[PDB]
């Protein structure tokens with residue numbers, strides 16, 4: 001359960017921002033797997049995405065400041081199996097794919113899309129590989145700061161994002177007017193807080209109604225709900241990739257969950273069954289997560305954006321693959337080598 005912080009640029013500045021096609025001809029497609037990209041090329045890819053969406057020119061973003069901001073955000077992640085920089089990078093890449101493939105500009109303001117992308121980058125900053133319940137139980141400093149207000153980790157992720165903006169030479173919004181600077185902070189707060197599953201469970205019935213009635217670009221509330229739905233679709237986007245991606249992410253997520261469970265046992269507390277390596281049956285848990293959480297999110301995305309149908313079909317297909325493969329996975333927890341390659 002020990003996950004370290006690596007701390008407390010020229011290669012990015014000299015080698016100019018790259019055209020996205022030079023990274024991969026499939027870079028702007030829903031079939032691209034951003035986890036395939038070498039970790040050392042991810043900061044360059046973030047810059048390339050912001051340039052391709054024209055955010056650097058439209059918001060007059062200072063490129064050295066942007067390069068420093070990206071490296072600070074990258075260094076802001078610990079190394080648990082799942083909630084690391086590669087997860088934030090892949091979530092950020094999905095936001096870019098929604099911009100490129102759906103008609104985001106016809107649904108949200110440019111500032112809201114910029115905020116969605118920056119939030120994707122920051123949304124799990126300094127994650128400890130433990131959930132909100134653990135913060136409360138371990139009586140952590142984060143729980144002391146935020147438990148009474150809800151969404152402990154998510155409030156921390158946003159505070160970490162703010163601390164980066166406040167770091168000398170990293171303020172990408174420095175030249176913004178007081179009103180626009182504040183709008184960026186408010187958007188980043190609401191978007192990061194939307195990543196708490198408990199918040200998604202609370203606003204579901206309303207997302208279910210926005211799609212039932214239809215999206216209205218003039219309803220300020222429709223903009224807020226959409227950002228919540230889009231942020232959760234970026235968060236769970238590993239489920240929209242190929243079977244091998246969902247299998248590898250299940251391995252990473254459960255290795256992280258099982259480490260929390262071992263830690264709870266060491267503290268003399270009984271962990272949730274899904275976090276207990278002696279009780280959890282991964283295929284059943286994954287199928288339940290896809291049916292209750294991931295599939296309804298992509299079904300809503302499909303209802304609002306017709307071009308998003310392929311995303312929902314891929315999630316449904318992956319859920320079908322888990323059912324069919326379950327007969328070959330006869331054990332609770334993970335095998336001795338922590339790998340699901342046998343599937």
Ligand SMILES: C[C@@H](Nc1nc(Cl)nc2c1cnn2C)c1ccc(C(F)(F)F)cc1
Pocket residue numbers: 194195196197198200231232233235236249250253285289293
């Ligand atoms: C922390 C993460 N939890 C998961 N739990 C399980 Cl059982 N499997 C998972 C994930 C993520 N990917 N997979 C495959 C999470 C859940 C819901 C959301 C939200 F709904 F809000 F979008 C955001 C993150």
Ligand SMILES: [Mg+2]
Pocket residue numbers: 123124153195
């Ligand atoms: Mg999170």
Ligand SMILES: [Zn+2]
Pocket residue numbers: 087091123124195235
């Ligand atoms: Zn996340």
